Amino acid sequence: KDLSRTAYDHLWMHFTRMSSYESAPVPTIVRGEGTYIFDDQGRRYLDGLAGLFVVQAGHGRTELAEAASKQAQDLAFFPIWSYAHPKAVELAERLAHEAPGDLNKVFFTTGGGEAVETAWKLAKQYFKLTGKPTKHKVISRAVAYHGTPQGALSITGLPALKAPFEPLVPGAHKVPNTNIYRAPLFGDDPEAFGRWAADQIEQQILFEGPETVAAVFLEPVQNAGGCFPPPPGYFQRVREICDQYDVLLVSDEVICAFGRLGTTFACDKFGYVPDMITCAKGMTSGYSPIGACIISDRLAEPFYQGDNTFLHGYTFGGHPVSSAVALANLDIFDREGLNQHVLDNEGTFFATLQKLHDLPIVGDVRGNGFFYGIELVKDKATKETFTEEETERVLYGFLSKALFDNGLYCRADDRGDPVIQLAPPLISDQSTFDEIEGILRTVLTEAWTKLHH
Amino acid sequence: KDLSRTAYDHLWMHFTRMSSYESAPVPTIVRGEGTYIFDDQGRRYLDGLAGLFVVQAGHGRTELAEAASKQAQDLAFFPIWSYAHPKAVELAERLAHEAPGDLNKVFFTTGGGEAVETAWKLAKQYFKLTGKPTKHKVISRAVAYHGTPQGALSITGLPALKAPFEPLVPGAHKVPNTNIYRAPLFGDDPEAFGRWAADQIEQQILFEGPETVAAVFLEPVQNAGGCFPPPPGYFQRVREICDQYDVLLVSDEVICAFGRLGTTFACDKFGYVPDMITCAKGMTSGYSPIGACIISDRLAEPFYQGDNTFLHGYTFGGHPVSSAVALANLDIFDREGLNQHVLDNEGTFFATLQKLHDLPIVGDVRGNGFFYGIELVKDKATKETFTEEETERVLYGFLSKALFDNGLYCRADDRGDPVIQLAPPLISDQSTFDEIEGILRTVLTEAWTKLHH
């Protein structure tokens, strides 16, 4: 009314229908502690998304706050633009050490979209430097989100995010996602489904001509569309196809890295080695912006000869304070054994959510690690979806309001989506899982009453 | 212990020829205080670029370090994705209050390129929402830098940054810059030159068809190419042209805002009101990454009606810690009067650098505020440029090494450029200006001896 008004008048929120706050206060979060956040009235919510798949270590970490002030006092900013500073160097070494294979070169960004832009640009120049100048196209999955700058947005697979802005950067082609719950083919045969879904990458390579294709971008577990884990055999086949056709595999780990799946790099959870990794989000548990494109030495080789230069960069990539905070965050990971904690508890988290399958609105519960989706349906036997009117009234309206009002934050850009996603802080335990399931049961029971069956 | 091997092995530096560090140490900056930085050997350097046109208030600001820890302990991260947090709201209000006209809506980013992407995307959607769907093209100046994600990169006017990555986002067209020192026409008539240079924007709009053109992107003072201030009457005429043809004017103030020219928004230094401002860099004096696209209420209006949404965003845009730090930085500005300090000292800074005109290698001294370029030439009478060999040996090699070794940091991405640019912290004073001139005189005297006349 003062500050909800100030927000509506000046703060253009991201992925927000701003008219929603014409005659309703903007929900304003002011404090977090552990797994909880608090609004400007002191109401408490379980942070069911860890902010935005970010706050791995939990909120209120004095050690990360003090890491920031200690570094800012000493050197808050100097560019890594033909210069180094110690924390960037130390963090690049650490990330390289954790990364698989020969992924030893770290190109810092501030965000994930910036990292995706980096990976595509690097692929293009790599092929120019190695005598394959027509290699430029990229492949990614339907419904996947890979960011919003216009190159990343080409790789993105959500038409609603793209249609207002087209034309974008040429060369981005789509293949099916691995949502077996709605598979057009082989939904009853996970291994065949995985082989089919991977083989569609080969088909698109052949369609466009392999000498024109540079890269394939895949999340370990796809977020947008509603949390799709990989089918059996999928990544091994993708790697084989990329090898065969001289195409680079980019693991887009902006969500999945830094323990979300119980490993530092999520490609290790599924046993594949990509050519590049994009990451951001949980590198600092969100405490200071930073991301990276981590790159195979094989790719870097030509750029490190003679007068060659990757004429690319970001003012704030590799920022001293962010780098210090990332290192302190990884120290928390190591000291508290957060990656192992996630591996040791993924089974019970999944089982706790799966209890919701006895509700008539719940069609599917799926995920991996500390990352799950609960897909809502109008009828479980037919997997019937919602009408446009039901989506507005029951999902955007009733469901999203009810989850928040009953103490569970888990809706941001996806308020109108029929899948509820969860990605709480990695310090979450059985008590957290129980609190989540209990609120979901209450709210999903009520949601069913809002549907005309 | 020397970090040079760790850096070469893992830190892919931005805009860097990495082979330069195969058999030479990486210059490693570890600490800053005020206008100075220190390397890991304890040598001290004047920060002649304020890092990267960033560190407006100077290094070692306890106030900013403590602002970061205070906020991070309370709420380090929550997304502004259909939610607000108090520091983002407060900063949006403050930026809106400082911005001219009806520029009251603040769309936060982390970086400048992200902000430029924002502005172009917003322009495209705006025109779709207001029944002008063919408006999509952008105009910008030759040799201008507007960022590196592939939409921003289209607006960028440096072919070396673009050729390896083409094709980019269609619709970006170029017009002449305002480098009066090498004007083909009106070199000794600034007013005529200004009219001419603005008129070229109208010509390009006509060439492409006004109903296909969305926006014009211009820095107040152009960085790349070597510091080109606007000629008299230029921006007034640009604003007239944009109004006539229903094209949006975007002031790209990533370098120029936050006191670099003596005002909070640099468009105010030159007396024009753009439709959008892009900014980043000095918002926090670089202490924590954040930027913004600041937007006219007239542009926002259609997006705030009904179901309409700008489906765009960045995880870390408007970060709580960055927002807190930005507010504390603006507090320093207000209490110390840094904007006025720059207005009061720009004349003597410029006059001090102009003393270098008596050197035979110095072709031009130009700039505005605390932003200058010193253009080097092989012959002052003819304005003769350097050969490729001279550029490598004398500029990339001798000059850039000598500047650093004599105590002046002022070379990053531009080590091989014939223009030396300067943009020190805004706390710089006459002593700083004299220190700069003295080092430049030493090094430029020596550089002349390296050239075969």
In angstroms, rounded to a whole number, what is the distance separating the alpha carbons of residues B198 and B236?
Answer: 9
The structure was resolved to a resolution in Å of 1.5
CA nearest B53: which of A196, A316, A208, A356?
A316
Sort B62 into a burial class: Cβ within 10 Å, 0-12 / 13-18 / 19+. Answer: exposed
**Closest CB to B89 among A3, A89, A254:** A3
Q: How far is A214 from chain B (nearest CA, A)?
A: 12
CA nearest B225: which of B245, B255, B189, B204?
B255
Structure tokens at A50: 């860890």
CA nearest A240: which of A205, A279, A193?
A205
Query: Other C-beta atoms within 10 Å of A191: how many?
Result: 12
Could you say which DSSP state residue B169 is in? -
- The answer to whether residues A86 and B19 touch, using CB atoms and an 8 Å cutoff, is no
Query: Other C-beta atoms within 10 Å of B327: how many?
Result: 16
- The answer to whether residues A311 and B163 touch, using CB atoms and an 8 Å cutoff, is no
After which residues does a break in chain B occur, C–N more than 2.5 Å? none
In angstroms, rounded to a whole number, what is the distance separating the alpha carbons of residues B206 and B201?
Answer: 9
Contacts of A148 in chain B (CB under 8 A): 117, 121, 312-314
- Strands of the sheet containing B29-33, edge to edge, are B29-33, B36-39, B44-47, B408-409
Annotate A164-208 with DSSP letters as a single string: TT-S--TTEEEE----GGG-SS-TT-HHHHHHHHHHHHHHHHHHH
Asked if B171 and A169 come within 8 Å (Cβ–Cβ), the reply is no
Domain boundaries, chain A: 3-49+337-449, 64-336
Q: Among positive and negative, which fits the CA dihedral A143, B151, A76, B290?
A: negative
- The answer to whether residues A84 and B18 touch, using CB atoms and an 8 Å cutoff, is no
Annotate A305-334 with DSSP letters as a single string: STT-------TTTT-HHHHHHHHHHHHHHH
In angstroms, rounded to a whole number, what is the distance separating the alpha carbons of residues A41 and A209?
Answer: 58
Asked if B286 and A121 come within 8 Å (Cβ–Cβ), the reply is no
Structure tokens at A320: 């001293």
Residue B304 backbone phi and psi in degrees, to 5: -95, 10
In angstroms, rounded to a whole number, what is the distance separating the alpha carbons of residues B278 and B220?
Answer: 11
| Domain A3-49+337-449 = CATH 3.40.50.2300 | no
Q: How far is B292 from chain A (nearest CA, A)?
A: 10
Asked if B89 and A11 come within 8 Å (Cβ–Cβ), the reply is yes
- The answer to whether residues B406 and B440 touch, using CB atoms and an 8 Å cutoff, is no
Asked if A86 and B30 come within 8 Å (Cβ–Cβ), the reply is yes
What are the distances in angstroms from CA A152 to CA A114, A156, A158, B34, B412? 8, 6, 12, 38, 27
Asked if A74 and B285 come within 8 Å (Cβ–Cβ), the reply is no
Q: Which residues pair with B248 in a beta bridge?
A: B215
Asked if A14 and B79 come within 8 Å (Cβ–Cβ), the reply is yes
Could you say which DSSP state residue A15 is in? T
Annotate B379-437 with DSSP letters as a single string: BTTTTBPPPHHHIIIIIIIIIHHHHHHTTEE--STTTT-SEEEE---TT--HHHHHHHH
- The answer to whether residues B55 and B286 touch, using CB atoms and an 8 Å cutoff, is yes
In angstroms, rounded to a whole number, what is the distance separating the alpha carbons of residues B82 and A403?
Answer: 15
Q: Which residues pair with B163 in a beta bridge?
A: none
Contacts of B301 in chain A (CB under 8 A): none
In angstroms, rounded to a whole number, what is the distance separating the alpha carbons of residues B60 and B360?
Answer: 38
Q: Checking DSSP bridges between strand B371-376 and strand B36-39, what pairing results, if any?
A: unpaired
Q: Which residues pair with A139 in a beta bridge?
A: A173, A216
Host H or E run for residue B267: helix B267-270
- Give the CATH class of B4-49+337-449: alpha beta
- The answer to whether residues A135 and A299 touch, using CB atoms and an 8 Å cutoff, is no
Contacts of B70 in chain A (CB under 8 A): 65
Contacts of B63 in chain A (CB under 8 A): none
Please name the residues in contact with B22: beta carbons below 8 A apart, sequence gap of 6 or more: A304, B8
Query: Other C-beta atoms within 10 Å of A163: how many?
Result: 11
Q: Which residues pair with A145 in a beta bridge?
A: none
Q: Identity (one letter) of the amino acid at B325?
A: V
Please name the residues in contact with B3: beta carbons below 8 A apart, sequence gap of 6 or more: A84, A86, A89, B26, B28, B40
In angstroms, rounded to a whole number, what is the distance separating the alpha carbons of residues A310 and B164?
Answer: 9
CA atoms within 13 A on the CB side of B195: 4
**Closest CB to B165 among A60, A124, A413:** A124
Q: For A203-210, which contacts have Cβ atoms below 8 Å and span 24 or more sequence positions?
A: A203/A175, A204/A139, A204/A173, A204/A174, A204/A175, A205/A139, A205/A241, A205/A245, A205/A247, A207/A173, A208/A137, A208/A173, A210/A245, A210/A246, A210/A247
The rounded Cα B344 to chain-centroid distance in angstroms is 22
Nearest CA in chain A to B80: A13
Query: What dihedral angle (degrees, nearest 10) is formed by the CA atoms of B195, B198, B203, B204?
Result: 160
Please name the residues in contact with B229: beta carbons below 8 A apart, sequence gap of 6 or more: B178, B221, B366, B367, B368
Asked if A52 and B120 come within 8 Å (Cβ–Cβ), the reply is no
Q: Which residues pair with B175 in a beta bridge?
A: B141
Asked if A308 and B17 come within 8 Å (Cβ–Cβ), the reply is yes
Structure tokens at B337: 């009067």
Asked if B9 and A93 come within 8 Å (Cβ–Cβ), the reply is yes
**Closest CB to B111 among A150, A306, A315:** A315
Structure tokens at B125: 């959607």
Sort B150 into a burial class: Cβ within 10 Å, 0-12 / 13-18 / 19+. Answer: buried
In angstroms, rounded to a whole number, what is the distance separating the alpha carbons of residues B12 and A253?
Answer: 19
Give CA angle at A57 (A407, B112), nearest 5°: 95
Q: At what angle do helices A112-129 and B112-129 cross, to 10 degrees?
A: 100
Nearest CA in chain A to B115: A149
What are the distances in angstroms from CA B410 to CA A23, B46, B337, B385? 52, 9, 25, 21
Cis peptide before B302 (omega within 30 of 0): no
Terminus-to-terminus CA distance in chain A, angstroms?
39
Nearest CA in chain A to B66: A69
Tell me which architecture the domain covering A64-336 has in CATH.
3-Layer(aba) Sandwich (3.40)
